């Protein structure tokens, strides 16, 4: 059903079982998250994960580099699903094959159970976010953070370049001067809206994304294209990218 895309658990079961084109794209994301947090020096005390949705794959390597992680989403349902796993409930999603993959990428310094435990311990707060708001976390009493991570969670809320830029500028209020912004996102994306019977598209390319980051008050440390074009019946892009930036 297309309605499955409105259900956080159906979404997990459709794509993340890791047992496919999507699995190969996920390995590209995981290799680059490991590179960012564990080879390229993005480390510190406090990391805020924006638009976490119901997934934890984006935090597995990050929890080696940050003592505290705040996860957030605009949807209560996403966060309910995520909390099933954080609280170790039996009906939670089985992330074990993914966790095992990341432990192997990290050279098996930790085994899966110890990695899951380190992540659950690091997650200190589960909060609503809204990148469209000048105070995206609603002014919760968090001190300025060392990193904000935004993985594949902006295009639904930011339908065009100016709104994308403004969301990045709003996220900057969460970071200390010099604090890292890590974006992962899709170049020239489109997603088929079954209800409205049209694609909705966000034309991100390197030059436009770099400009949006720099006008949102960051300096770019590194941009990289990390996968080739992908096409399913319901989405397209011309590859995924990651970008590491520092707040002014």
């Amino acid at each position: 059903t297309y309605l499955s895309h409105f259900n956080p658990r159906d979404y997990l079961e459709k794509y993340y079982k890791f047992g496919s084109a999507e699995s190969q794209i996920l390995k590209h994301l995981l290799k680059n998250l490991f590179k960012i947090f564990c080879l390229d020096g993005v480390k510190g005390d406090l990391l805020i994960d924006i638009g976490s949705g119901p997934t934890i794959y984006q935090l597995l390597s990050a929890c080696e580099s940050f003592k505290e992680i705040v996860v957030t989403d605009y949807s209560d349902q996403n966060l309910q699903e995520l909390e099933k796993w954080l609280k170790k409930e039996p009906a939670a999603f089985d992330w074990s094959p993914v966790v095992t993959y990341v432990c192997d990428l990290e050279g098996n310094r930790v085994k899966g159970p110890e990695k899951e435990e380190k992540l659950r311990q690091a997650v200190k707060q589960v909060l609503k976010c809204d990148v469209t708001q000048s105070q995206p976390l609603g002014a919760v009493p968090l001190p300025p953070a060392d990193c904000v991570l935004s993985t594949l969670c902006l295009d639904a809320a930011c339908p065009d370049l100016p709104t994308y830029c403004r969301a990045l500028r709003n996220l900057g209020s969460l970071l200390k001067p010099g604090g890292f912004l890590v974006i992962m996102d899709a170049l020239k994306s489109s997603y088929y809206m079954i209800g409205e019977q049209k694609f909705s598209s966000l034309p991100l390319g390197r030059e436009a994304v770099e400009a949006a980051v720099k006008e949102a008050g960051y300096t770019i440390e590194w941009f990289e294209v990390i996968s080739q074009s992908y096409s399913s019946t319901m989405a397209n892009n011309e590859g995924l990218f990651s970008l590491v930036a520092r707040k002014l």
Partner: peptide, 11 residues
């Protein structure tokens, strides 16, 4: 929503 891969979450 809709969460259609590679979309992961809702900022």
């Amino acid at each position: 929503f809709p969460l259609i891969f590679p979309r992961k979450g809702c900022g």
